[PDB]
Design a protein around this ligand. Sequence first.
Ligand SMILES: COc1cc(/C=C2\S/C(=N\c3ccccc3Cl)NC2=O)ccc1O
Length: 261
Amino acid sequence: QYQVGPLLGSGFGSVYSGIRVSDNLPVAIKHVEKDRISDWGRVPMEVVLLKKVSSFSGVIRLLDWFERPDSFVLILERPEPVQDLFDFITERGALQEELARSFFWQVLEAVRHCHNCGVLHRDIKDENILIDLNRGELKLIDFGSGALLKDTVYTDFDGTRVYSPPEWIRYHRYHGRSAAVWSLGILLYDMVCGDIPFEHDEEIIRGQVFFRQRVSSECQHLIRWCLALRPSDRPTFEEIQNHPWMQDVLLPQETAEIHLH
Ligand SMILES: COc1cc(/C=C2\S/C(=N\c3ccccc3Cl)NC2=O)ccc1O
């Protein structure tokens, strides 16, 4: 069936590079131990969520999955060549606003897709975004801490803390969309400054954003908006994409030729 390659990453489980014997298609082989899965639907919720979002290249595609005695094995698409946003920023530093605009736009489109399919990702960050270097397209990955999207309150969280909103830190309560917008705020800052704005709980609670890089006023505005302390003061996905800084986004293909080649 599949031919296993080198380990791509380890945590939310372990993920290996792979080739599908059928057609030599590049795939990724994810291994998740059953004893670590707290959410089921009988398969892990991660499988359910991935199936709901299959269609559109902004979200990672689930090609197949297998059940083993103690683990589940996920077969996911693998772009070639590819690099994740964390490594991309780590090696290249703070991104240019034009490039950050293109990336952030693609992520917004991706999360908007997840929501239409009734899925909440709950771990939006640089590490969970892959870059198809050739096509200039971004993919959202690792739905392992995500949930079915609801309009009521969430009292559980198992995503990245430094990307989590102050209402989570304070009260252990959040609503899906406003919380997503907050993490998007952290992400956009990460893109334009080369690092995340908050490290400790108290910084998150305070929500005072400092820019360590020359960033345009409009970008700072959008960032400070997504990072509003009160969830209700945060912009909606529509409000973000109608923001003046999001005007005139590049096509993914232009983005590659200008910024990736
Ligand atoms: C990591 O690189 C790739 C990931 C994916 C899909 C992945 S990787 C993932 N979770 C992890 C993240 C970091 C460490 C360990 C795990 Cl299990 N979840 C996915 O859907 C594809 C193609 C790739 O080239």
